[PDB]
């Protein structure tokens, strides 16, 4: 017969102002700042805060099969997280699209 209601003032509970619009205005470094940001929040309490990065990544980067790069990486490669930085750098070049930054 438990749990006494209470309150908070952080904003929404755990969240970060960060996301953008397109790799183009992201330096590798902010991509690193972004993705590793799953290393933290994900393992956290809730998955209504993860779907935020999850679906920006999936959006801006396009191919090969979004999340799959984040999640089921590749056996002989980089497993967490500078290989999704790597292997992504490929796609956009063979399929037209511009790249990272300064």
């Amino acid at each position: 017969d438990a749990e006494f209601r209470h309150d908070s003032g952080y904003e929404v509970h755990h969240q970060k102002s960060e996301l953008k619009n397109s790799i183009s205005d992201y330096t590798e470094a902010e991509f690193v700042q972004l993705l590793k940001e799953i290393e933290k929040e994900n393992v956290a309490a809730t998955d209504d805060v993860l779907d935020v990065l999850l679906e920006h990544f999936v959006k801006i980067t396009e191919h090969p099969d979004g999340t799959d790069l984040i999640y089921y990486p590749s056996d002989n490669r980089d497993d967490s997280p500078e290989g999704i930085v790597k292997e992504i750098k490929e796609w956009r070049a063979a399929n037209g699209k511009p790249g990272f930054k300064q």
Partner: antibody, heavy 125, light 113 residues
């Protein structure tokens, strides 16, 4: 200036119904945000907790009671209430209303800064 | 109901003598939002309580740097390193994470002779 004032009959009689009124000064119950708890202490014993309201008429009762207890307020009047049904000899007690305050904006820092004096009820026929 | 436990239930001493009490919550009081809503109350003779310390260890308005109190999870302690008269009274620990919100039973710090 904040001060808390309980009030009642002070001398009831068995299986009936009480009403406790708790009353504020110096500040206001609308954008105060604080909550209000009823805690009673029996003549020559400890302390026990009866109920609680929140800045938005939210009401949370001790299960080891609940059915008897009834808590409420008015912001216009600027006071919090408490009915206990079929009052029994067991209710014989000094009753305390209590503000559940905090450190401003840091809402989750909730304690009981300020407790009133106490309104004493004897329930004997 | 839920139970909080005090040790001692009566601690008598003379003035300027260091004092210290302890409360253990039958099962952890660490509230889902993360914090440990435990308080340390006091009933000076013939008048109300009287908060002192909230959230394990943050000391409330105007209560001297002397009335410390640390702890964690279930164990928690209070200390007066200078018992004075404004200190002698009943001391109740308390919880605030689960309904109901239960005080200890009450230690009666007091004058020794």
């Amino acid at each position: 200036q904040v001060t808390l004032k309980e009030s009642g009959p002070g001398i009831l009689q068995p299986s009936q119904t009480l009403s406790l009124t708790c009353s504020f000064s110096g500040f206001s119950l609308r954008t105060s945000r604080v909550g209000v708890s009823w805690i009673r202490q029996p003549s020559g014993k400890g302390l026990e907790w009866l109920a609680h309201i929140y800045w938005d008429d939210d009401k949370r009762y001790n299960p080891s009671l609940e059915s008897r207890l009834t808590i409420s307020k008015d912001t216009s009047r600027n006071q919090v209430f408490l009915k206990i049904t079929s009052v029994d000899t067991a209710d014989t007690a000094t009753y305390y209303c209590a503000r559940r305050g905090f450190y401003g904006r840091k809402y989750e820092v909730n304690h009981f800064d300020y407790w009133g004096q106490g309104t004493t009820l004897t329930v004997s026929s | 109901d839920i139970v909080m436990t005090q040790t001692p239930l009566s601690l008598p001493v003379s003035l300027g003598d260091q004092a210290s009490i302890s409360c253990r919550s039958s099962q952890t009081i660490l509230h889902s939002n993360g914090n440990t809503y435990l308080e340390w109350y006091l009933q000076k003779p013939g008048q109300s309580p009287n908060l002192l310390i909230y959230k394990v260890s943050k000391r409330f308005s105007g209560v001297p740097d002397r009335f410390s109190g640390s702890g964690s999870g279930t164990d928690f302690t209070l200390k007066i390193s200078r018992v004075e008269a404004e200190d002698l009274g009943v001391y109740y620990c308390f919880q605030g994470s689960r309904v109901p919100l239960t005080f200890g039973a009450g230690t009666k710090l007091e004058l020794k002779r």
